Ligand binder design. Structure first.
Ligand SMILES: NC(=O)c1ccc[n+]([C@@H]2O[C@H](COP(=O)([O-])OP(=O)(O)OC[C@H]3O[C@@H](n4cnc5c(N)ncnc54)[C@H](OP(=O)(O)O)[C@@H]3O)[C@@H](O)[C@H]2O)c1
Ligand SMILES: NC(=O)c1ccc[n+]([C@@H]2O[C@H](COP(=O)([O-])OP(=O)(O)OC[C@H]3O[C@@H](n4cnc5c(N)ncnc54)[C@H](OP(=O)(O)O)[C@@H]3O)[C@@H](O)[C@H]2O)c1
Ligand SMILES: NC(=O)c1ccc[n+]([C@@H]2O[C@H](COP(=O)([O-])OP(=O)(O)OC[C@H]3O[C@@H](n4cnc5c(N)ncnc54)[C@H](OP(=O)(O)O)[C@@H]3O)[C@@H](O)[C@H]2O)c1
Ligand SMILES: NC(=O)c1ccc[n+]([C@@H]2O[C@H](COP(=O)([O-])OP(=O)(O)OC[C@H]3O[C@@H](n4cnc5c(N)ncnc54)[C@H](OP(=O)(O)O)[C@@H]3O)[C@@H](O)[C@H]2O)c1
Ligand SMILES: O=C(O)CCC(=O)C(=O)O
Ligand SMILES: O=C(O)CCC(=O)C(=O)O
Ligand SMILES: O=C(O)CCC(=O)C(=O)O
Ligand SMILES: O=C(O)CCC(=O)C(=O)O
Lengths: 447, 447, 447, 447
C-alpha cells in the first residue's frame, strides 16, 4: 500500500519481464528510488499507469546486419534501436558499435536518455541504439559497408521528427558520415535533421565535437562554485581518451585546472604537470594508437597497467569512458585521497556502491544525465540549425551550451532542495527530468 | 451586366447549391456586399471564375466518430473538416465540439477564416472543423476516447504544411493534448506543427492561451484611440465565459477598464465593480460550473436568467461567446444606453440587423475577422516557432501580437478609406482580406 | 577445419548473443544437428554466411501496448513480432496472447515456423508474435481495446506481401475479427490478405477451422500405411482442447477408428468406443468452460486431475497444445503399453529427452513441423483465395489440403532416404525444410 | 601515370558515354583543366572514383509532356530534370523553357550548378531541368496548361529536401506561380520550400527578382577594385533583356556606370547615354515586346540587326543572355576596343576561344559559376526563410547578397593565388567549388 511498496512491486515486475538485463535494472533502480520521493509529496504522478508506461519502451527494433569483409567473407552482426519515449520530442540518442552491446545495454542507455534529454530544456524525447559489431581493426571500406547495411534497415524507422540518431562509443565523425550518406540514398532526401554529429560542410554544428566534455567541465565548475571553491588550480582525473575525455581535458585546462591523468581500456597515464592535448589527439585521432604511446613520447608522463587511474590523489574526478568503471572501492580510495567533486562525462560510470560512498563521505556528485547533457543539448541545437537552414558561429553555440549547463545545474540543485535532499544532484536530476516528461505524458493521453 | 446583378445572381446560385445552411449564407452575404465595392473599381478581381472558386471549399470531410462511454455503451457522432482555401498557406483553423455543429456552421467558420487569416499578414490558409459531440458532462476518459476516435480519421488529412487545426468552442488545452498525442501515435512522428494551442512543454507558444481575448482588447483600444478616447475608465460588457472572454476580461481590466458583466449559455452575471478573474477561472476551468456559482460566491455579483446581458449600460461591448448572440434589438438597446464601440471576440456574434444599427447609430464596429485575429495570429507564431525549433518569451510574442493587432486595425481603416467608406472596418477588413487571397490565387492558376 | 567445428563454434557464439533463451537454443541445435548431414554431402550450403543469416531474425519488434480496463485503469503489456525469414514469401505465423510469452519464446516459435512453412510447398516465409497480455477473465470490450491498441502499432509492419499474422493460443476467431477491423481502420484499405483465420463473410476460407486436425490425419494416411496395424480402429489420445486438438479429434471415424479422451492444463479423461465432438464444441468454444464441464457427463467420460495425460493405453497419440508436454516418465510409459505410432500436433510438442525415447524405442514419429502443417497450409489457401477474390467450396479446399499433405509426407520420405536415415521423418522434414529456404537465400544474394 | 594522362583518358571516356552533347563536353572540359591543378598538389581527391562519380549525374529524368493549345490541338513536348549532385544539399537549380533545350544542355547547366552552388557557402546541391516547349506566342492559359502538365510528372521527383527548382530562360514569375500552384494540388501540401522565385504573398523572398543581375554587378565591382579602378564612370555592355540583364543594368547604373547597350535574340540597341530602366521593363514585361520597340520610343537609342552588340566600345562586358553568345572574334573586338573586364551573368556565354583571347589580352574574367551565383544564393535564402516561416526585409537580404558576392570573389582570388595562378578566377572558382563538394562526398561514402 505505501509508495515504497507500490514502487518495489513494479520493480519486481520489471525484473520479471526484463530478465537478464542487469544494466537496465541498475538504471531503473536509481531513478525509481528518486520517484519514491516525488510520489510521497505528489501522488497524482502515479495516475493513468504513468510509471508503467514510462519504463516500457514505446518501440524496440532488433535486426540482422549482414556485411561482407575485405576477404570477401560474409558476417552477420546484430543491430538495435530502442525508441523509448517521445512525449517531449522525437526520440533522440546515439549509436554504440562495440562487441558488448545487447538489448539490456541499449535500454539502459535509452532510459537514461529520457531524463537527460528532458533536463536540457530542449524539445527531445529519448532513444538509443547500436550493434555488437566491432569497428576496431576494420578497414574504412568494412566500416562503410557495415554502416550501409545497418542504415539499410534503420532508415525506415528514423526521420527529422521521428528519431534522430548520433554517435557514442564506436561511432564518431567517420561513421556518421557513412550513415547519413546512405540514409539520403535510401530516402532520396537530403534530410539534414535525421542525424546529429554531422560534418560542418554538410549540416553539422560548430561546438558539437567539443560539447560533451566542455559541458561536463561547465557543470563541474557550477558544483565547485556552489561549494565556495573555483575550478582554477584544481587537480583533475579524466578517465577515457575518446570524444568526451579529450574535450573535458581541453576545457579543464583552459579554465586553469590541471589534468593529472587519462586512460584507455588497456591502461592509464599519469601526467602530473598536465596534458598536451594536441599530442593526445595526434595519438588517438591520426595514429589510432594506445595511451602508452603518449607516455613514451612525453617526458614527465608514465604508463601504468597496474592499479587504477582512481588511485591518483585528486580534487576532482571526471569518469568519461564507459558504464561501471568506478566501483565502491575506487570511490573509497578517491575519498581517502581528498577528492571533493565527481561528475560523470560517461553514461553510468559510477556503480551504485560508489554513489553511496560519495554520499556517506560528503563528496559532491554530478550524475551523467545532468553533467554529460551538453552533447545531446548541442545535438538538439544542430537539429534547430537544420530546421532553420541556419548555421551558427562557434561563439554563439558555445554560449548557448554554457547557459544550458548552468540552468541544468540550477534545476538539479533547486529540485533536490525543494524535495528535502539539498546537494543530492541525483535526486534533483531524476525528479526534474521525470516531472517534465510526466506532465507531457498526462497532457497527451494514453498512447 | 451591372456588378450588383452579377454578384447577386452568383449569391442566388450559392443559395441553391448550399440550401439549408443559413449561417454560411449569412457569412457569404456580408463578404459579397464588400466585394461589390472592390469590383466596381477593379472589375478584374472577377476574372478566371475567381469568386466562384473562392466561395467553394477546396475540400470538405465528414466522417463517423464512434466512441465508447464509461458504461461501455457505443455512441456515434459526426466529425467535420472543411479545408476552404490554401492560397496563402496551409489550411488553418480550429475545431468546435458542440451539439449544434453541422456542415453549414463549419463552412461559415471556414469561410470567415480565409479573410481573417489573410488579414494577419502571416502565411496561413483557411479551414475549420468540429463535431456534434457534446463535451459537457463527459469524463476525462470519455473526452480522450472521443478525441482519439476523431483523430483516427482526421490524422490522414492534416499535417504541418497541409492543415493545422486548433481549438474553438468545446476544444481547449485538454482536448488539444489528447488530439496531439493520438496524432503522433497515428503518424509515428513528433510533428509539432500539426496543431496549435499545444502545451508549453510539448511545443506550444507562450501567449496563445491568452491571445484571442488579449488581441480583441488590443484591437478595440485602437478603435477607441481613433475617437480621442482611452480604454482606461470604460465600462465593458463581455459575453461568454470561456477562453476568449476570460482573457478579454483580463486584458481590459489590466488596461484600467471595468468589466460590468459576463455570461454563459444558461444566464448572465452583473458585476458593477468588475470581475475577479482568478475566481472565474477557478469556476470555469477547475469546477466546470455555471456562472450562477460565481454570483452565489461573489458579493456584488448578481445572476440573471431574464432579459439580456446587452441590457447593461456600457461604453464598450465585446461579444465573445457565439454566432448571432447580439441581434438588432440588442443593438438598439446598447446604442440607447450609451455604447460607442463594439468589437467581436467571437465569430459572427452580431446579426446583419445589428450590424446596420451600428452603422445607423455611428457605433464604431470591429468585425470578428479583424478583432479576433490575434488568436490565429499567435497560432501562426506557434507554427513559426515549431518550424524553427525555437521557443520565444512571453514578452517577445506579446509584443508581436500588439504590433499585429495595430497593423490589422490600420489595414482595415486605410482600406475602408481607400474605397470610400471611412471608419467602416467591415468593408476594410473584407476587402483587404480578399485582395491578398485573390492576388495569390490568380498567380497560382486554376487549381 | 572440420564440419563439426564451424557448427559448434557458431552454436557457441549463438549462446552468447541469445543468452537466456533456451527454447530457441534447443530449436537451433536440432536444426544444426541436421545441417551437419547436409554439409557432408552438399558443401556449398554454408557459402556466403548462409547459416549465420538464417539463425538471426531479419527483424524483431517489441512494443508497448497500453490499454484501459472496465474500471478506467491503465495497464501496459508488451507485444512482439519477429519476422524471421522471408526467402520464400511474406512472413507468416500466428499471434499468441499468454502471460508466459517473451522474446525468447517468440523467437523459438518463429524459427520453427520457417521450416514448417517451407515444408508445405507454398509461398510463405516465417514469423511469429503476440503478447504477455492475459486474455483470461477479460470482457469483450477489454479484449477489443487490447486488440485495437496492439494493432495500432503492428499495422505499420504488416501487409499482404509483407507479413500475414494468424491466431494461436489466446488469439481465436474473435480476436482476428478485432485485429482485422482495426487494421482496416488504420490503413483505410479492405486488405483481406493481411490476416488469416478470418470469418467466412469477410474473407475467410472454408476449411481453416478443421485444417490442423484434418492435417494430423491425412498425414497418418501414408505414415501408418507403410507398416500394417489395420487401415481402421486405432486409439488416439489427443492432448489438448482448442482449435488443433478439438479438430484433430473431430477428424475421427474417417473410415472407422476408436478415440479416447483429452486434456487441458487442469485434467484428462478415459472412454469406451469414441468421444462425440458435438458435445465438446458447445462447451469449449461457444461457452468457454473447463474439461470438468465436459467430463461431468458423458455416459462414460471421467475426470482425472493428479497424475499425467500419458498413462492411457494408446496405440497412436496426438498431443496439440503447447511446447514441452512429453519428458522422462511419459515418453517411456508412452512406449510401454506395446505402443507404437505417434503424430504430434503442437509447436515442438516433445522435449530432447522424449525424442531419444522414440528413436531408441523404434517409435514411428510424425513430427511437429510436418503433420500439423495443415493449418498454415490452409492459411496460405486463404491468402490465395483473397489474392484472386475467390471463395472456394469446402470439397475443393479440403481436396487441395489432401494434395498438400501427401507431398509433405512424400518430401519427408524421399529426402530421409536420399540422406540415409530413411523413415526418421524428423530428419527428412528437417532437411527438406532447410534446403528450399537455403536455396532461395543463395539465389537472392546477401540481404 | 601523370595526372594530365589520368584526367585526359577519363575525358575521352566521358566523350564516348555522352556522345553528341557538346555543351556538356565544353563545361566538363574547363572544370577538368582546373582539376589537373588540384591533383598535382593533393592527389587523394581522385580516391574512391571521386571524379568518375562527380561527372555522372545521380539521376536524370526525361518525360513526355502532353498539352492542348487554345484551338483544341494536342502537342507533345519533352521535359527534363537532372539531379546532378546532392552532397551539400538538396538538388537546386532552375527550369529552362526554350526550343533549343535538350538533355546535353540541361546537363551542362546542372554540372555548372554543382560548383556554383558550392561557391555560395550555402547548403544546396546541383541540378537543372527544362523543356523544349517554346512559350513565345502562347496565351497565359496555354502556358498554365503546359506548366500543369509538366508538374504532373515533376512533383513526384521534387520536394523541399529533395529537389527545389526555380526559373531560368523562359520561366519567370508567371510560370513559377502555375508550377507551384499545381505542385500543391498534386501533393496536397502547402510546401513553400519546393520552389524558389515565388511571389511575395505566397512564400517568395525580397531581392530574388533582382538578385542575379545585382550579384553579377557586385562581383564585377570587386574584380574592378582589385585592379585599382572603380565601376562608377565606366561604360558597360549588357547583352540580353530578360531577368538577369534587366537588374544588372539597374545595378550598374545605380553605381554610377552607363550601360551603352543591350539585346534580345532579334537584335541589339545602342544606348550611348544609358538605359531607361522603367521603359525597358514596361516594354519587356507588360507588352512582351522586342527591343526594337525601345529604340522606336526613345530618342538617342538605335536598333541594329547588323554586326554585334560586342562591336560597341566599352570598359566592361556583361553577357546576360545565353550560352556561347560571346565568341573568339567577339573577344578580339572587345579587347581591341578597350574592354578590360568581362563578368558572366549568363551560364557559359564565353566560348573556349573567347576565354583564350581574354587570358592573352590581359582582360579580367569573372566566370558564370561565380559571378551569377547571386541568383541561387538568394534562392537558398528563400528556402531558409521558408524553412523558418519567416520573411526578411529587402535591406537585410540585399546586404546578405553583397557579403556573399564579396566572399565568392575573395575565395576565387585567394584560391587561384593559392594554387599558383593568381587572378585566374576560373581556376579559383572551379577548385574552391570542387573541394567543398569533394570533401563532403568522401565523408558520405560510395552512394
Ligand atoms: N560522444 C558523446 O557525445 C557522448 C554524450 C554523452 C555521453 N557519452 C558517453 O561517454 C562515454 C564515452 O563516449 P565517447 O563518445 O568519448 O566514446 P569514444 O570516443 O569511443 O571513447 C571511449 C573511450 O573509453 C575507452 N574505454 C572503453 N571501455 C573502457 C574501460 N572499461 N576502461 C577505460 N576506458 C575504456 C576507450 O578506449 P579503448 O580504445 O581502449 O576502448 C576510449 O578511450 C560513453 O559512456 C558514452 O555513452 C558520449
Ligand atoms: N479560442 C480561440 O482561439 C478563438 C479564436 C477566434 C474566435 N473564437 C471564437 O470565440 C468564441 C468563443 O470561443 P471560446 O474558444 O471562448 O469557446 P469556449 O472556451 O468553449 O467558450 C464558449 C463560451 O460561450 C458560451 N456559449 C457557447 N455557445 C453558446 C450559445 N450557443 N449560446 C450562448 N452562449 C454560448 C459558453 O457557455 P456554455 O458553457 O453555457 O456553453 C462559454 O462561456 C467562438 O465564437 C469562437 O469561434 C475563438
Ligand atoms: N491451426 C493452428 O492454430 C496451428 C498451426 C500450427 C501450429 N499450431 C500449434 O498448435 C498448438 C495449439 O494451438 P491452438 O491454436 O490449438 O491454441 P488454443 O485454441 O488456444 O488451445 C490450446 C490448448 O492447449 C492447452 N494447454 C495449455 N497448457 C497445457 C499443458 N501443460 N498440457 C496440456 N495442454 C495444455 C490449453 O489449455 P488452457 O485453455 O487451460 O490454457 C488449450 O486447451 C500450439 O503449440 C501452436 O503453436 C497451431
Ligand atoms: N534567372 C536567374 O536567376 C538566373 C541565375 C543564374 C543564371 N541565369 C542565366 O542567365 C541567362 C539568361 O537568364 P534569364 O533568362 O533568367 O533572363 P530571361 O528572362 O529568359 O531572358 C533571357 C534573354 O536572353 C535572350 N536570348 C535567349 N536566348 C538567346 C539566344 N539563343 N541568342 C541571343 N539571345 C538570346 C532573350 O531574347 P528573346 O526574348 O529574343 O529570346 C532574353 O532577352 C541564362 O544563361 C541563364 O541560364 C539566370
Ligand atoms: O547527441 C546525441 O544524441 C548523442 C547523445 C547520447 O547518446 C548521450 O546523451 O549519451
Ligand atoms: O487556428 C487557431 O489558432 C484557432 C483560431 C480560429 O480558428 C479562429 O480564428 O476562430
Ligand atoms: O500462420 C498460420 O496460419 C499458422 C501458424 C501458427 O503458428 C499459428 O497460427 O498458431
Ligand atoms: O535560383 C535557382 O536555383 C535558379 C537559378 C539557377 O539555376 C542558376 O543559378 O543558374
Amino acid at each position: 500500500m505505501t509508495v515504497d511498496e507500490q514502487v518495489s512491486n513494479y520493480y519486481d515486475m520489471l525484473l520479471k519481464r526484463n530478465a537478464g538485463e542487469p544494466e537496465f535494472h541498475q538504471a531503473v533502480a536509481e531513478v525509481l528510488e528518486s520517484l519514491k520521493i516525488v510520489l510521497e509529496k505528489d501522488p497524482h504522478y502515479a495516475d493513468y499507469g504513468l510509471i508503467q508506461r514510462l519504463c516500457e519502451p514505446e518501440r524496440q527494433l532488433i535486426f540482422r546486419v549482414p556485411w561482407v569483409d575485405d576477404q570477401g567473407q560474409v558476417h552477420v552482426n546484430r543491430g538495435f534501436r530502442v525508441q523509448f519515449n517521445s512525449a517531449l520530442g522525437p526520440y533522440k540518442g546515439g549509436l554504440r558499435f562495440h562487441p558488448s552491446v545487447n538489448l539490456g545495454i541499449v535500454k539502459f542507455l535509452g532510459f537514461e536518455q529520457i531524463f537527460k534529454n528532458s533536463l536540457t530544456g530542449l524539445p527531445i524525447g529519448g532513444g538509443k541504439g547500436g550493434s555488437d559489431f566491432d569497428p576496431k581493426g576494420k578497414s574504412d571500406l568494412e566500416i562503410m559497408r557495415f554502416c550501409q547495411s545497418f542504415m539499410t534497415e534503420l532508415h525506415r524507422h528514423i526521420g527529422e521528427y521521428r528519431d534522430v540518431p548520433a554517435g557514442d562509443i564506436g561511432v564518431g565523425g567517420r561513421e556518421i558520415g557513412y550513415l547519413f550518406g546512405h540514409y539520403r540514398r535510401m530516402a532520396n532526401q537530403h534530410e539534414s535533421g535525421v542525424l546529429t554529429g554531422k560534418g560542418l560542410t554538410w549540416g553539422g554544428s560548430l561546438v558539437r565535437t567539443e560539447a560533451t566534455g566542455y559541458g561536463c567541465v561547465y557543470f563541474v565548475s557550477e558544483m565547485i562554485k556552489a561549494k565556495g571553491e573555483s575550478i582554477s588550480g584544481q587537480k583533475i582525473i579524466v578517465s577515457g581518451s575518446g570524444n568526451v575525455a579529450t574535450y573535458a581535458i581541453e576545457k579543464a585546462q583552459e579554465l586553469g585546472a590541471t589534468v593529472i591523468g587519462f586512460s584507455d581500456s588497456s591502461g592509464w597515464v599519469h601526467t602530473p604537470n598536465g596534458v598536451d592535448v594536441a599530442k593526445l589527439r595526434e595519438i588517438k585521432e591520426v595514429r589510432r594508437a594506445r595511451v602508452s604511446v603518449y607516455a613514451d613520447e612525453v617526458e614527465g608522463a608514465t604508463y601504468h597497467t597496474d592499479g587504477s587511474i582512481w588511485d591518483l590523489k585528486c580534487d576532482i574526478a571526471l569518469p568519461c569512458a564507459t558504464q561501471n568503471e568506478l566501483n565502491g572501492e575506487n570511490a573509497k580510495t578517491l575519498a581517502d585521497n581528498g577528492c571533493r567533486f565527481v561528475a560523470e562525462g560517461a553514461n553510468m560510470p559510477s556503480t551504485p556502491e560508489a554513489v553511496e560512498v560519495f554520499r556517506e563521505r560528503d563528496i559532491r556528485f554530478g550524475p551523467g544525465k545532468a553533467a554529460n547533457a551538453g552533447g545531446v543539448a548541442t545535438s538538439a541545437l544542430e537539429m534547430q540549425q537544420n530546421a532553420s537552414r541556419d548555421s551558427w558561429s562557434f561563439e554563439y553555440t558555445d554560449e548557448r551550451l554554457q547557459v544550458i549547463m548552468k540552468n541544468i545545474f540550477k534545476t538539479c540543485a533547486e529540485t533536490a532542495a525543494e524535495y528535502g535532499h539539498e546537494n543530492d544532484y541525483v535526486v534533483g536530476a531524476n525528479i526534474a527530468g521525470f516531472k517534465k516528461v510526466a506532465d507531457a505524458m498526462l497532457a497527451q493521453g494514453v498512447i
